[PDB]
Amino acid sequence: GNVYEDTHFFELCDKYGIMVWQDFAMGCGNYSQRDNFAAALEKEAISVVVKLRNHPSLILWSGNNAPNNDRVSRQVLSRVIYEFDPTRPYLPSYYKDPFYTENPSQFVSEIGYHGCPNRETLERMFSPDSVNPWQNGVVGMWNDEWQTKANRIYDDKFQGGRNDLMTNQVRIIFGEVPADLDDFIFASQSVQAEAMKFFVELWRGRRPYRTGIIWWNIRDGWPLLSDAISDYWGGKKQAFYYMQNVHHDVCCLINPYMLKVDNNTLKDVVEVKDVASGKQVFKGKFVSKANQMSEIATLPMQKGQGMLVISYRIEGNEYFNHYLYGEPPYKLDQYRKWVKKCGIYE
Amino acid sequence: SEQSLNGRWTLKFFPQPAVPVMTIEGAEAANGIVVDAVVPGNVEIDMEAAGLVEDPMVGNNIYKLRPYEGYQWYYSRTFAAPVVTEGQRLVLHFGGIDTFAEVYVNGIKVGSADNMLIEHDYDITSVVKEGENRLDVIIRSSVMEAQNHFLGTLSIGNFSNEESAPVRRAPSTYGWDIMPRLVSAGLWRDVTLRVENPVTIVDANWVTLSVNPKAREASESLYLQTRLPFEMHDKVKAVITISRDGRQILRKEALMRKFANLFTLNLSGVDAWWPRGYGEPALYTAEVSLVDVTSGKIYDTKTSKIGFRTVKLELDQPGQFQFIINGEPVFAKGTNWVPLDALHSRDASHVEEAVQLMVEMNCNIVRCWGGNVYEDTHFFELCDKYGIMVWQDFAMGCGNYSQRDNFAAALEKEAISVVVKLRNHPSLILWSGNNNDRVSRQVLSRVIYEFDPTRPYLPSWGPRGYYKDPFYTENPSQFVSEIGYHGCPNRETLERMFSPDSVNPWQNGVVGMWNDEWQTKANRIYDDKFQGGRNDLMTNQVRIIFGEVPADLDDFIFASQSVQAEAMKFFVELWRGRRPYRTGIIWWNIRDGWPLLSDAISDYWGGKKQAFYYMQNVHHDVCCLINPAANGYMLKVDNNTLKDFEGVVEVKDVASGKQVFKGKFVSKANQMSEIATLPMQKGQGMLVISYRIEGNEYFNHYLYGEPPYKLDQYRKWVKKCGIYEL
């Protein structure tokens, strides 16, 4: 759905090492099968491929479509790759529920979860008389200014829709709605941080089988409410720092317990402890093999809603992580003090 | 507003020179004959009304129109300019032009026609002046236009004329085995002047996603496209109304934010559409309108009648499929639709009479043969009212076609035009290409894939001997789409067709030998005078069943029509009686398009050959029929409904008078039920099947024994059974 980024974008991806999965500019749906559209698309496909076929970051072309009888994705675009780029592969096309933990998709591509942006962002997106999300103080009901920033394409007055995804996540994971706007900001960015962190930990945990995970939005493009872990003006949300600790080249994490480390390199100790009680759950050395998920030890099932800390050091450098164990609904003030005693994050 | 330009025009015809006349100056400067024409109409009608040509329906007067195939036709008339406010568009609509023609308005060319099967709309807003406008159409020779193309090997030697391959016309107009060579020409459909506001509906495609007849609900989607100026965006609403007999059932208003929208409706309290037998053909008036939200002015309205039905062809060899309408497997029983008239401008006057022939025979399906033009909307409106499913075949006939770009472009334009026009009728259930063909397995599959993903698309006689031959009784096809038997027309039709000295078929008094007028109306495309051929099927089949061909004409008519009736009845009974394996049978055919000698069961003029009445009793919703067996016979009953029926059936012998069986049968819904095993009968004769259902007595029969028979004995058996008059 995005314009083709210019050469300077791919140049930065070459400089740092970030591979690119470039989709041809077509949205969710199908297009014309006639000669007029296919010719206009081939002119664009040729101009784009020849422009970007010299960057080592680019690894794959895709049509972003649905089927096997589509001329656009199975003929027009495939023929351009066949002649102007025969080196890159082409392709035509609560969070712990079984919809996520049992999905047999080795390479997931569009995993998302809502989260309210920072307060400074809210004060700049909405007028002063509409910074508060609730209409007439009725929680769960959004005013019209929050409805528009939830990506309402037209001026159709309605209640609910997309913003209800923020309340639905806060109610299940934390009990109910925090009337205090700052308490709601902390609750919304925590249900997004804990969810997509659990998703990266789940794909990296079942590594032998899982092949990759690409979450949704790391920087949006307009003053709006979205699944992004950072807003337009640069306000990084809590999900940014959460997913950072589960994205190191060597990361120790816990999956539903099972302490395991995943290594995303070609190069060949850990301390688990409850934050409240302080009892050492496990301590010992580990040998994380290269490009392999090495399991450590099975941890006992700790009773009571709490939180663990996963402190591990490699080559003199220290790293931190955590794992929230138990079952929702939780308590917002209790969770606010769990991460405070953790020391990582605000 | 839509002012009709139909009526009296001025037609001028002349032979086409080496360079076809394509300008109004060359037409007005040529040497020809100027007569008065009638629009809609064919050029043969206009010349016949002035005595220039004789009646092509009588004798061999059809070949006397041969020299006119290389003529040009110059239509001309004058029309007043309708009041056009600024922003509106004046469109000149052509329902049909046969074929290659150059349209002119006020001396300025406003389009070039190249197809007789689709419509042609021309925007003539700028060229129309104030007062006396002039519309001049100049048609050229469709036969000579075929020589502008180089044919392939597979496009030559087919039964379809080589002149038909490189052009987009009805293949039967160049002559077939059941329709004459009357290529004809002219504006054979309506010519009107439509006005279009700046806001006007472009298309209203209704699609039935899912249907629930039991709960009386269905999901109806509407795909609306409209021309909406941006200064009118967010200021016009779309009013969707689905009513039935003045009783509104839905009223949804939506503001036009985009130019194209999908309005998915969840109807409540609505009945599903069903073919004949499986229920009621529930139709609903679905009207859309673009109304201004402020002034309340309505800009354009598109009203139609849709039906909540779903189609799904269930495949497993040709014919290995069964139609599934609304989730239930239906057994198709119907006829093939041939041209209604060689002069196709009169098809609008025959559609109402011909459709009634199917209602009377209770046909659930009708396969519009590819050799014919595309029938207009009424045909499909009647098939919606009476619940007759339609199997439309694209206009292509026996033979392979071109594999090149310029032909696929002309066919794609035709396919998109006819699909968009005929995709809102609940009767139509299948698209088919009659033909590694680029046209059958690509150009048309692509048109269906994008413009109608709701109906299935299909990329796809013999010795004509005894109807009990293993060629028919052992044909493994579950669904036969073409099967017929020859039968001489009624005497009154023969006396109106041939000349007085040619009503008797036997040339020089010897049987089997046909005179030249009978050979002409078999049908032979070209006056190659010869003996035998297609007409010999009549005397051959009569000689098989009755042993010897009668010399008397009235005895020959009764002999031929009886062999045709006993054969066509035997086939429908052989398919309805072998369910659930046999899924349908489409016989050929129900009505002739010319005064001709065919294998149809009724002629052009109204003459119901005896096969029309024999097949009425084997096309009932619940029908008892006897099928042959090795050591005996089998009394069966077939139910083409979703209901159960009880009744009693009594089978007697017509000659002796004894009783063979009498018992109560139970016919479950949508399946053949075996009643009893009738013992073997001695010699030859006829059994009578009488069965009563809800106090109504229905009749049938079975002819036992093996051929040959005696014509006098068979005529007496019929008269005793008392079912069919003689």
Q: Do B412 and A33 lie within an 8 Å CB cutoff? A: no
Distance CA A88, CA A59 (A): 6
Distance CA B475, CA B167 (A): 36
Which chain A residue has the Cα nearest residue B442? A69
**HSE, side-chain direction, 13 A CA sphere, residue B624:** 29
Distance CA B275, CA B403 (A): 38
Which chain A residue has the Cα nearest residue B257? A154
B242-247: long-range pairs with CB below 8 Å, 24+:
B242/B267, B242/B270, B242/B284, B242/B285, B242/B286, B242/B306, B243/B284, B243/B285, B243/B287, B244/B270, B244/B282, B244/B283, B244/B284, B244/B285
Beta-strand runs (E) in B82-232? 89-94, 101-105, 108-113, 120-123, 132-139, 191-196, 200-212, 217-227
DSSP conformational letter for B271:
P
Rounded to the nearest angstrom, the minimum Cα separation between B401 and chain A is: 21
Distance CA B301, CA B541 (A): 56
Cβ contacts of residue A254 below 8 Å, gap of 6+? A201, A260, A272, A299, A308, A310, A323, A325
Q: Which of B258, B293, B449 to mutate to test the interface with A (most CBs of A within 10 A)?
A: B449
- Token pair 């220039």 is at which residue? B52
Q: Do B412 and A34 lie within an 8 Å CB cutoff? A: yes
Distance CA A319, CA A322 (A): 11
Q: Do A69 and B412 lie within an 8 Å CB cutoff? A: no
Rounded to the nearest angstrom, the minimum Cα separation between A146 and chain B is: 21
* A152 interfaces chain B, CB cutoff of 8 Å: no
Q: Do B446 and A154 lie within an 8 Å CB cutoff? A: no
Please provide residue B281's backbone torsions phi and psi, each rounded to the nearest 5 degrees.
Answer: -75, 80
Q: Do B449 and A34 lie within an 8 Å CB cutoff? A: no
Q: Are B396 and B171 in contact (CB under 8 A)?
A: yes
Distance CA B665, CA B668 (A): 10
Q: Which is nearest to B591 in space by CA: B415, B351, B373, B398? A: B351
The β-bridge relationship of strands A20-23 and A58-62 is parallel
Q: Do A33 and B257 lie within an 8 Å CB cutoff? A: no
Q: In sequence order, what are the beta bridge partners of B666? A: B646
* Tokens matching residue A236: 């990084």
Q: Which is nearest to B307 in space by CA: B391, B361, B380? A: B380
Planar angle of CA B177, B182, B184, nearest 5 degrees: 150
Cβ contacts of residue B58 below 8 Å, gap of 6+? B496, B497, B498, B499, B595
Q: Are B154 and B124 in contact (CB under 8 A)?
A: no
Q: How far apart are the first and last CA of chain A?
A: 35
Beta-strand runs (E) in B6-96? 7-15, 33-39, 71-80, 89-94
CA torsion, ordered B631, B633, B639, B644, to nearest 10 deg:
-90
Packing angle of the helix pair B377-385, B347-361 (nearest 10 deg)? 20
Distance CA B534, CA B522 (A): 6
Q: Are B138 and B22 in contact (CB under 8 A)?
A: yes
Q: Are A273 and A226 in contact (CB under 8 A)?
A: no
Planar angle of CA A291, A293, A296, nearest 5 degrees: 135
Q: Which of B261, B441, B450 to mutate to test the interface with A (most CBs of A within 10 A)?
A: B450
Which chain B residue has the Cα nearest residue A35? B409
Q: Could you give the maximum distance between any two Cα atoms of chain B, in Å?
A: 87
Q: Are B43 and B14 in contact (CB under 8 A)?
A: no
Query: Residue B352 burial by CB count (10 A; 0-12/13-18/19+): exposed, middle or buried?
Result: exposed
The β-bridge relationship of strands A308-314 and B260-268 is unpaired
A69: chain B residues, CB-CB within 8 Å: 445, 449
Q: Are B211 and B185 in contact (CB under 8 A)?
A: no
Q: If interface means Cβ-Cβ distance under 8 Å, which residues of chain B face chain A?
A: 257, 409, 412, 445-446, 449-450
Whole-Å CA distances, B317 to A287, A334, B321, B475: 64, 72, 10, 11
Distance CA B368, CA B262 (A): 31
Which helix (H) or strand (E) covers residue B520, if one does?
helix B516-520
**HSE, side-chain direction, 13 A CA sphere, residue B91:** 17
* A277 interfaces chain B, CB cutoff of 8 Å: no
Rounded to the nearest angstrom, the minimum Cα separation between A171 and chain B is: 32
CB atoms within 10 A of CB A85: 17
Q: Do A33 and B450 lie within an 8 Å CB cutoff? A: yes
Distance CA B534, CA B536 (A): 5
Rounded to the nearest angstrom, the minimum Cα separation between B450 and chain A is: 7
Distance CA B26, CA B607 (A): 47
Q: What resolution in angstroms, rounded to 1 decimal?
A: 3.1
Which helix (H) or strand (E) covers residue B719, if one does?
helix B711-721
Q: Determine if residue B370 is left, alpha or beta; phi over 0 gives left, psi from -120 to 50 gives alpha, anything else beta.
A: alpha
Q: How far apart are the first and last CA of chain B?
A: 54
Q: Are A270 and A252 in contact (CB under 8 A)?
A: yes
Which chain B residue has the Cα nearest residue A71? B446
Q: Are B702 and B633 in contact (CB under 8 A)?
A: yes
Please provide residue B420's backbone torsions phi and psi, each rounded to the nearest 5 degrees.
Answer: -60, -30
B445: chain A residues, CB-CB within 8 Å: 69
Distance CA B88, CA A125 (A): 44
Which chain B residue has the Cα nearest residue A68? B449
Q: Are A216 and A227 in contact (CB under 8 A)?
A: yes
Method used experimentally? X-ray
DSSP states of A153-185 as a string? SS----S-TTTHHHHHHHHHHHSS--SSHHHHH
Name the 3-class secondary structure at A316.
Answer: coil
Distance CA A183, CA B3 (A): 70
In this structure, which amino acid lies at residue A202? L
Rounded to the nearest angstrom, the minimum Cα separation between B308 and chain A is: 26
Which chain A residue has the Cα nearest residue B233? A154
Cβ contacts of residue A11 below 8 Å, gap of 6+? A55
Q: Do A33 and B446 lie within an 8 Å CB cutoff? A: yes
* A69 interfaces chain B, CB cutoff of 8 Å: yes
Rounded to the nearest angstrom, the minimum Cα separation between A290 and chain B is: 49
The β-bridge relationship of strands B33-39 and B7-15 is antiparallel
Rounded to the nearest angstrom, the minimum Cα separation between B260 and chain A is: 14
DSSP states of A7-70 as a string? HHHHHHHHHHT--EEEEPS--SS----SHHHHHHHHHHHHHHHHHHTT-TTEEEEE-----TT-
Query: Residue B203 burial by CB count (10 A; 0-12/13-18/19+): exposed, middle or buried?
Result: middle
Cβ contacts of residue A160 below 8 Å, gap of 6+? A142
Cβ contacts of residue B400 below 8 Å, gap of 6+? B152, B154, B155, B158, B435, B437
Beta-strand runs (E) in B426-472? 428-432, 457-458
Q: In sequence order, what are the beta bridge partners of B111? A: B103
Which helix (H) or strand (E) covers residue B48, if one does?
helix B43-48
DSSP states of B350-406 as a string? HHHHHHHHHHHHT-SEEEE-TTS----HHHHHHHHHTT-EEEEE-S--SS----SHH
- Token pair 């002796």 is at which residue? B656
Q: In sequence order, what are the beta bridge partners of B375? A: none
Whole-Å CA distances, B355 to A107, B371, B499, B612, B614: 58, 19, 30, 14, 19
Distance CA B684, CA B713 (A): 10
* A34 interfaces chain B, CB cutoff of 8 Å: yes
DSSP conformational letter for B548:
S
Q: In sequence order, what are the beta bridge partners of B676? A: B635
Preceding peptide of B580 cis, ω within 30°: yes
Q: Which is nearest to B313 in space by CA: B201, B389, B226? A: B389
Q: Which of A65, A71, A72 to mutate to test the interface with B (most CBs of B within 10 A)?
A: A71
* A39 interfaces chain B, CB cutoff of 8 Å: no
Cβ contacts of residue B221 below 8 Å, gap of 6+? B206, B207, B208, B209, B262, B263, B264, B265
Rounded to the nearest angstrom, the minimum Cα separation between A114 and chain B is: 28
* Residues in chain B after which the backbone breaks (C–N beyond 2.5 Å): 316, 435, 460
B446: chain A residues, CB-CB within 8 Å: 33, 71
Rounded to the nearest angstrom, the minimum Cα separation between A73 and chain B is: 14
A141-150: long-range pairs with CB below 8 Å, 24+:
A146/A225, A149/A125, A149/A223, A149/A224, A149/A225, A150/A224, A150/A225
Which chain B residue has the Cα nearest residue A67? B449
In this structure, which amino acid lies at residue B157? G
Rounded to the nearest angstrom, the minimum Cα separation between B93 and chain A is: 25
Cβ contacts of residue B657 below 8 Å, gap of 6+? none
Rounded to the nearest angstrom, the minimum Cα separation between B255 and chain A is: 10
Name the 3-class secondary structure at B702.
Answer: strand
* A74 interfaces chain B, CB cutoff of 8 Å: no
- Exposure pattern of B253-286 as b/e (b: 16+ CB <10 Å)? eeebeeeeeeeebebeebbbbbbbbbbebbbbbb
B450: chain A residues, CB-CB within 8 Å: 32-34
Distance of CA B450 to the CA centre of its chain: 25
DSSP states of A75-107 as a string? IIHHHHHHHH-TTS-EE----SSHHHHT---SE
Q: What is the CA radius of gyration of chain A?
A: 23
Cβ contacts of residue B346 below 8 Å, gap of 6+? B42, B340
Q: Determine if residue B127 is left, alpha or beta; phi over 0 gives left, psi from -120 to 50 gives alpha, anything else beta.
A: alpha
CB atoms within 10 A of CB B68: 20
Planar angle of CA B451, B452, B458, nearest 5 degrees: 120
Name the 3-class secondary structure at B103.
Answer: strand
A32: chain B residues, CB-CB within 8 Å: 450
Which chain B residue has the Cα nearest residue A30? B450
Please provide residue B674's backbone torsions phi and psi, each rounded to the nearest 5 degrees.
Answer: -80, 130
Name the 3-class secondary structure at B530.
Answer: coil
User: Which residue in the set B257, B409, B445 is minimally distant from A154, CB to CB?
Assistant: B257
Query: Residue B27 burial by CB count (10 A; 0-12/13-18/19+): exposed, middle or buried?
Result: buried
Q: Are B683 and B700 in contact (CB under 8 A)?
A: no
Distance CA B432, CA B411 (A): 14
Q: Are B566 and B544 in contact (CB under 8 A)?
A: no
User: Which residue in the set B257, B409, B449 is minimally distant from A69, CB to CB?
Assistant: B449
Cβ contacts of residue B371 below 8 Å, gap of 6+? B160, B170, B171, B172, B176, B179, B338, B339, B395, B397
- Token pair 């059941």 is at which residue? B178
Distance CA A18, CA A264 (A): 14
Q: Are B240 and B275 in contact (CB under 8 A)?
A: no
User: Which residue in the set A33, A35, A154 is minimally distant from B449, CB to CB?
Assistant: A33
Planar angle of CA B216, B218, B219, nearest 5 degrees: 160
Preceding peptide of B40 cis, ω within 30°: yes
* A158 interfaces chain B, CB cutoff of 8 Å: no
- Token pair 């044909």 is at which residue? B475
Distance CA A25, CA A3 (A): 7
Q: Are B392 and B422 in contact (CB under 8 A)?
A: yes
Q: Which is nearest to B707 in space by CA: B570, B611, B525, B590? A: B570
Q: Are A191 and A174 in contact (CB under 8 A)?
A: yes
Please provide residue B242's backbone torsions phi and psi, each rounded to the nearest 5 degrees.
Answer: -120, 105
Distance CA B686, CA A80 (A): 72
Cβ contacts of residue A298 below 8 Å, gap of 6+? A257, A258, A259
The β-bridge relationship of strands B457-458 and B428-432 is parallel
CB pairs A-B closer than 8 Å: 12
Whole-Å CA distances, B594 to A167, B341, B344, B602, B603: 74, 6, 11, 11, 8
* A33 interfaces chain B, CB cutoff of 8 Å: yes
Q: Which is nearest to B426 in space by CA: B287, B283, B267? A: B283
Q: Do B450 and A32 lie within an 8 Å CB cutoff? A: yes
Query: Residue B508 burial by CB count (10 A; 0-12/13-18/19+): exposed, middle or buried?
Result: exposed
